[PDB]
Amino acid sequence: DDEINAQSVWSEEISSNYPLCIKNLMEGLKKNHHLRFFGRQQLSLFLKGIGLSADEALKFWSEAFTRNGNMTMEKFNKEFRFSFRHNYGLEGNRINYKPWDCHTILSKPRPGRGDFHGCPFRDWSHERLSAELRSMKLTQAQIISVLDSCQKGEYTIACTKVFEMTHNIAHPNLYFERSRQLQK
Numbered sequence: 156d157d158e159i160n161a162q163s164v165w166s167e168e169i170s171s172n173y174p175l176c177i178k179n180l181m182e183g184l185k186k187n188h189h190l191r192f193f194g195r196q197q198l199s200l201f202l203k204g205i206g207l208s209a210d211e212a213l214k215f216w217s218e219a220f221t222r223n224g225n226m227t228m229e230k231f232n233k234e235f236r237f238s239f240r241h242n243y244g245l246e247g248n249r250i251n252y253k254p255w256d257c258h259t260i261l262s263k264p265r266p267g268r269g270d271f272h273g274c275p276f277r278d279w280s281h282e283r284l285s286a287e288l289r290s291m292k293l294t295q296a297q298i299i300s301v302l303d304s305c306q307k308g309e310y311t312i313a314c315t316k317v318f319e320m321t322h323n324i325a326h327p328n329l330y331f332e333r334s335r336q337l338q339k
């Protein structure tokens with residue numbers, strides 16, 4: 156709880172370790188105060204994979220869904236609380252909900268309008284990727300190298316390139332713990 160909790164996952168320090176997909180999901184949750192089923196599972200199981208406790212997860216999801224008066228606490232407890240508790244097995248279920256790897260993430264149905272699951276290196280446009288990479292302090296030479304892998308369909312190589320360029324197999328939780336390891 157000292158490192159990963161409901162408040163510290165919104166921190167810049169912790170969130171600077173997220174791969175592009177989790178960053179995309181967190182951003183959609185912050186502005187819409189809600190995520191769809193596929194996006195819910197991708198992000199929820201990742202946070203569980205980095206050590207977010209059951210109590211902190213329910214604190215995290217409840218505040219996020221009810222933020223800015225998006226929905227009441229009663230609507231959340233009646234329409235979403237069970238599903239999040241289900242993912243941690245707090246209702247007695249013994250389904251093995253492991254965090255999704257990149258292969259599993261890319262295999263899900265592709266995101267449409269309003270969806271935030273998936274992998275940005277395949278689902279975003281080159282224009283959207285380029286602007287996002289520039290805010291991450293990448294130069295156009297580095298950008299053209301990442302888009303090259305994207306155009307070739309090697310999305311895990313493009314994400315591995317971003318890691319090396321932003322720092323000094325194929326799993327989003329492996330991205331986090333490698334990056335978070337370089338912080339300590």
Ligand code: SF4
Binds near residue numbers: 274330
């Ligand atoms: S390669 Fe995997 S970890 Fe990286 S952005 Fe795509 S789905 Fe996320």
